[PDB]
């Protein structure tokens, strides 16, 4: 939709809050810091960063080899959907090592794209995707390494509202780009927020 609605929604979802510090990356994404030390990461850049991520992910027309991963047990609900709204697969919680490199493993599945809730939590799939030419997209926050993730959306991954609202917004614009959502409104009222 219009950027104003999404911006005000992530303002409602408190996606602009940062942490006490930042790494030497993401200063291209922060706006400044509050007197308490928190960061106010500029949602404006986040909007078209996730928009370009959406442009990236509707480009392969075979959504089967798109695993969404979430090691933290707080955004599992959001990753549970976004896998039947689109055709992507989604592994939640535990990621057995070898699923991207061990071709004798029962869960061997090499993707064309990886979507990750937070580079800090599930770093193991990042390091394993480094051995298979797997492009990676993650919702990095401040204090999150850029070590191998290739497209990083500057959002919050520690909030009930941030995750969920952000995932739904991404999926909404992806379906819009695919053409299924002809100009209209939301039919996916917030369900991914934690119980």
């Amino acid at each position: 939709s219009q950027r104003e609605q999404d911006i005000q929604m992530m303002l409602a979802a408190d996606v602009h809050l940062g942490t006490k510090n930042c790494d030497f990356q993401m200063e291209r994404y922060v706006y400044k810091r509050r007197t308490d030390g928190i960061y106010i990461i500029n949602l404006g850049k986040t909007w078209e960063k996730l928009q370009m991520a959406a442009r990236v992910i509707v480009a392969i027309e075979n959504p089967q080899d798109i695993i969404v991963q979430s090691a933290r047990p707080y955004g599992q609900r959001a990753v549970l959907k976004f896998a039947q709204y689109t055709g992507a697969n989604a592994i939640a919680g535990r990621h057995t090592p070898g699923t991207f490199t061990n071709q004798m493993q029962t869960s061997f599945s090499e993707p064309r794209l990886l979507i990750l809730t937070d580079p800090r939590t599930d770093h193991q799939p990042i390091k394993e995707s480094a051995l298979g030419n797997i492009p990676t997209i993650a919702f990095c926050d401040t204090d999150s390494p850029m070590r191998y993730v290739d497209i990083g959306i500057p959002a919050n991954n520690k909030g009930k509202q941030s995750i969920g609202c952000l995932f739904w917004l991404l999926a909404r614009m992806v379906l819009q780009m695919r053409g299924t959502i002809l100009p209209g409104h939301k039919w996916e009222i917030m369900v991914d927020l934690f119980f």
Binding site: Q8, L11, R34, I40, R77, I189, L193
Partner: protein, 119 residues
């Protein structure tokens, strides 16, 4: 000692996974069902399996465990899709904006958003 071999643990888990419909709480009913729903050679191995299954029914009658699956709450689906309120949890008015975020909305954003607040 009284710890259970991986074979009896596994077979108890499988029989509960595929035959939770009729199997009951009493040990003797569990063994008289096991003797025909599966082929166990040693009678005392069958007794161990039946007692273990009874113990896990005691475990599960209070809540779900990490072992079994199918009908994936314990017996019936549709647990969380029903948690959809008639109004979204995300409000749009007077939405949690502070001084530095006000300075942001003075930046590229629109300072006259519907949810702007002086907090």
């Amino acid at each position: 000692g009284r710890v259970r071999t991986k074979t009896v643990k596994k077979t108890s888990r499988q029989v509960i996974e595929k035959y939770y419909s009729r199997m009951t709480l009493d040990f003797h009913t569990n063994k008289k069902v096991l003797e025909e729903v599966s082929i166990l050679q040693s009678k005392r191995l069958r007794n161990k399996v039946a007692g273990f299954t009874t113990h896990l029914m005691r475990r599960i009658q209070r809540g779900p465990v990490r072992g079994i699956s199918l009908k994936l709450q314990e017996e019936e689906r549709e647990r969380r899709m029903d948690f959809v309120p008639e109004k979204s949890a995300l409000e749009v008015d007077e939405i949690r904006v502070d001084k530095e975020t006000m300075d942001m909305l003075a930046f590229l954003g629109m300072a006259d958003l519907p949810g702007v607040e002086r907090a």
